[PDB]
């Protein structure tokens, strides 16, 4: 809702058909009469090249934004599901590495206990005699 | 809340039933059935035109 | 503000150079793909001819209700499209009834001119 | 599904990060070894430049695909309205000129019905 | 062939040049605006840094249902999955605590048995004397 020469709210928004940028009819016309050019791109432009006045014709002045809103909320749904899944699988790695290493460390005890036991009867039967 | 309660929000169960000699309300409901049935019959035409080619490509 | 095809506020508007008219990129492309023309002026235009040229987000209010809104809005647009087409058929139909009377009347004038011509001959005698 | 250089079904697809296009590794590798470039855009590309995670996907079928479907519905129906807005502006324009020619002619029917009867009223009396 | 955020099959895939991973444009464009970095590698990434790279779904023969039945199922399936996924994340953290506690419980056994065994072996070496 702004002209691209002065910066005012344009009451007659006309556009140049070389670089897409909505100017105001007064300012663009003064730029063309100064030098036949587009102010933004410095390309060739004339007064007849400009498309002036509002466009509403066979159109009539809701619905489409509801679908846009439905997209915007889904966009969050996906973003949330990602971060929830990352932590899901990243914790499963800790779970898996632990359970494996737990039962691995558990076998240390089974071995250790039977050797400790062997030391007892050995020494006991020796110290006896 | 929908997942916890185990209840999905009800949609428009209206277009399917309707009734003839109704009122101004069923005059609308009737006119709804026409436009969607024409859209339906147009929506089945562009499917059958390609037919199984569009399906087997996927 | 409004694209002159659908009536939406365009989210990627494009202007035709044959006729000064800001369309929406999606809708103008479909028309050109159907027939290489401009929808308003019927001038020969192509897709490369188009020059790609406010966004304010709708905050409905304070979700199950939004389901039924979208249902109602599609239900309304379906009837707002239907009502506008039966009116077109009946305005053309009532126009055709005028054309018959228009051409039927100018045949009835020919007989009335003969009765005037017959009268002008008798008056002179 | 296809390789853009050969046109075959690539058995080891590797996507480049300068011109986004799925090339066959064995084909594109030789293209890079010839000259360090991407075949399509002719931008620089090396072999290391050539290349989901934990979220499981399902195939693209008839939420996002459903939302883009409803765009097609409305965007097509919007053009359907133009066919009846444009045709209405021709019928009403022909009706306006038709009713004007009817209104301009019926004044002349009213005068001839006066004049032909007045000539019969005049002549019969004499 | 899929997107690396939502788990989609993208309609306009775009690849980032810092980490070779294909995302769907909307979802990667959202992440960069939220926090300007690559979601996977956590490396600096902008919207201009992205590089853009057809899919067919056969709309069912019985395609009313799109408004009522299909859309209903989509928001059911989104709702009951993430709720069940939140249930899965909660148990992984609880089962984490049972893993680490049982692990540390085993560490104490080993430490206790390491003092036990070698001293039992030492006593056999001393017995000879």
DSSP string, chain E: ---SSS----SSEEE-SSS--EEEHHHHHHHHHHSSB-TTT--B--TTT-EE--------S---TTTTHHHHHHHHHHHHHHHHHHHHHHHHHHHHHHHHHHHHHHHHHHHHHHHHHHHHHHHHHHHT-
What is the C-alpha to C-alpha distance for residues E40 and E37, in angstroms, rounded to an integer? 9
**Shortest Cα distance, chain C CAs vs residue D48, angstroms:** 37
Compare all CA atoms of chain E with the CA of B32 and give the residue at the minimum distance. E64
**Residues of E in Cβ contact (< 8 Å) with C74:** 67
Determine contact, residues A22/C13, Cβ cutoff 8 Å.
no
Token output for D27: 């084909």
Q: Which residues neighbour E123 within 8 Å (Cβ) at sequence distance 6 or greater?
A: A119, A123
Question: Residue C20 is nearest to which of A21, A51, A69, comparing CB atoms?
Answer: A51
Cα distance between residue A86 and residue A89, in whole Å: 6
Residues with their C more than 2.5 Å from the N of the next written residue in chain C, i.e. before a break, are 53, 62
Interface contact B20, partner E, CB < 8 A: no
CB contact under 8 A, E78 and D63: yes
Shortest CA gap E64–chain D (Å):
12
3-class DSSP assignment, residue D40? coil
E120 close contact with A: CB closer than 8 A: yes
Q: Do A119 and E121 touch (CB under 8 A)?
A: yes
Contact with chain E for residue A88, Cβ under 8 A? yes
CATH architecture, domain E1-55 = 2-Layer Sandwich (3.30)
CA distance A112 to B48: 75
- The answer to whether residue B11 neighbours chain C at the CB level (below 8 Å) is yes
E67 touches chain C (CB under 8 A): yes
Residues in C touching E71 (Cβ below 8 Å): 67
Cα torsion through D56, D58, D64, D65, rounded to 10? 160
Which chain A residues contact residue E89 at CB under 8 A?
A: 84, 87-88, 91
Quote the distance between the C-alpha of residue A87 and its chain's center. Answer: 19
Domain ranges of chain D: 1-126
Q: Which of C71, C79, C83 sits opposite B11 (nearest CB)?
A: C71
Question: Does D86 contact chain A (CB < 8 Å)?
Answer: yes
> In sequence order, which residues have a C-beta less than 8 Å from that of residue E95 and are 6 or more positions away?
A95
Cα gap B40→E58, rounded to integer Å: 16
The nearest CA of chain A is from the CA of C4 a distance in Å of 5
Technique employed here was cryo-EM
Name the minimum distance, in Å, from the CA of B8 to any CA of chain E. Answer: 7
Class of domain C1-56: alpha beta
DSSP state letter for D50: -
Q: How many CB atoms lie within 10 A of CB D110?
A: 10
**Rg of chain D, C-alpha, whole Å:** 38
């Amino acid at each position: 809702m702004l002209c691209a020469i002065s910066g005012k709210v344009p009451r007659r928004p006309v556009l140049s058909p070389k670089s897409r940028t909505i100017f105001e009819k007064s300012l663009l016309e003064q730029y063309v009469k100064d030098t036949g050019n587009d102010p933004i791109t410095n390309e060739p432009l004339s007064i007849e090249e400009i498309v002036e006045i509002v466009p509403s014709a066979q159109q009539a002045s809701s619905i489409p934004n509801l679908l846009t809103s439905l997209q915007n909320e889904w966009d969050a749904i996906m973003l949330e599901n990602f971060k929830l899944r990352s932590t899901l699988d990243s914790l499963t790695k800790k779970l898996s590495t632990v359970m494996y290493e737990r039962d691995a460390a558990k076998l240390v005890a089974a071995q250790l206990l039977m050797e400790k036991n062997e030391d007892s009867k050995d020494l006991p039967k020796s110290s006896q005699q | 809340a929908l997942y916890t309660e185990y209840l999905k929000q009800r949609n428009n169960k209206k277009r399917r039933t309707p009734d003839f000699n109704d009122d101004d309300d069923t005059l609308f409901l009737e006119e709804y059935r026409r436009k969607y049935p024409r859209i339906d019959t147009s929506r089945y035409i562009p499917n059958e035109s390609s037919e199984v080619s569009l399906l087997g490509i996927v």
